[PDB]
From a paper:
The sulfur atom of phosphorothioated DNA (PT-DNA) is coordinated by a surface cavity in the conserved sulfur-binding domain (SBD) of type IV restriction enzymes. By contrast, the SBD of the PT-dependent restriction endonuclease (REase) SprMcrA from Streptomyces pristinaespiralis has a relatively relaxed sequence specificity, targeting GPSGCC, GPSAAC and GPSATC, but not GPSTTC or CPSCA. The sulfur atom of the PT linkage was inserted into a cavity which formed by Y31, Q32, Y78, P79 and A82 through Van der Waals interactions; the phosphate groups flanking the PT linkage formed electrostatic bonds with R29, R73 and R85, as well as hydrogen bonds with Y31 and A101.
The SBDSpr–GPSATC complex crystals belonged to the C2221 space group, with two molecules of SBDSpr and two molecules of GPSATC–DNA in the asymmetric unit; the structure of this complex was determined to 3.3 Å by the molecular replacement method with the Phaser program, using the structure of SBDSpr–GPSAAC as the searching model. In all structures, the ND1 atom of H102 formed H-bond with O6 atom of G4, and the OD2 atom of D104 bonded to the N4 atom of C7. It's worth noting that the ND1 atom of H102 also formed H-bond with N7 atom of G4 in GPSGCC and GPSAAC sequences, while this H-bond was not existing in SBDSpr-GPSATC complex. SA5 showed a significant deflection in GPSATC sequence, compared with GPSGCC and GPSAAC sequences, leading to formation of another H-bond between the ND1 atom of H102 with the N6 atom of SA5. In conclusion, HGD motif formed five H-bonds in SBDSpr–GPSGCC complex while four H-bonds in SBDSpr–GPSATC and SBDSpr–GPSAAC complexes, which explained why SBDSpr showed a highest affinity for GPSGCC. In the case of GPSATC, the percent solvent accessibility of T6 methyl group was calculated to be only 10–15, corresponding to fully buried with the SBD-DNA interface. The multiple C–H…O contacts between the methyl and Y78 were believed to be attractive for GPSATC. Difference in the weak non-bonded interaction between GPSATC and GPSAAC results in a lower KD values for GPSATC than GPSAAC bound by SBDSpr.
Numbering used by the authors: 4 to 162
DNA sequence: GGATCATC
DNA sequence: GATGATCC
């Protein structure tokens, strides 16, 4: 029930498709997850209007874009939607992929979908502390291997 | 709107 | 071959 929902979450995170720079993975997705991991910790709303998130995640990409991350939260949240971790509804029709640039801006600017982390994962990280460490340590090892994470970890309530 | 690369 | 993204 709860433990199965836990290892479900990790399985999806371990099997994430992320782009990789010359020296490591692009941090678009972990910046997104840790932003939602922190919000789930403080019990904050689950879903948010895209402009409110586009700013929030985009702000963190501006501050901690260690691999030239530009403030484009639409790339990770589409990969995470395909990964089963993100809920997108409000839009009409079908959700695009994260291959391109213009269409990613146009789709989000036109539909303006309300998005958040998946309902069972958000509530799980709220109540379960065992899962917050297993999701942070997993993301920190695979994505931030060699980098200073504590500035980002601070700016999301995850110190 | 596109060429292009790396990863899946 | 489809998907996460750089770059024009």
């Amino acid at each position: 029930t709860d433990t199965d929902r836990s290892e479900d979450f990790l399985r999806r995170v371990r099997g994430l498709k992320a782009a990789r720079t010359a020296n490591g993975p692009r941090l678009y997705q972990p910046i997104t997850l840790l932003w939602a991991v922190g919000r789930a910790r403080r019990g904050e709303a689950r879903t948010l209007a895209w402009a409110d998130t586009d700013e929030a995640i985009g702000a963190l990409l501006k501050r901690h874009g260690a691999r030239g991350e530009r403030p484009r939260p639409d790339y990770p949240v589409l990969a995470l939607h395909r990964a089963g971790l993100w809920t997108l509804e409000g839009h009409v029709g079908e959700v695009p992929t994260a291959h391109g640039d213009s269409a990613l801006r146009n789709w989000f600017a036109e539909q303006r979908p309300v998005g958040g982390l998946a309902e069972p994962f958000h509530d799980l990280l709220h109540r379960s502390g065992h899962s917050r460490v297993s999701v942070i340590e997993a993301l920190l090892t695979t994505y931030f291997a060699g980098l200073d994470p504590v500035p980002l970890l601070e700016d999301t309530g995850l110190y």
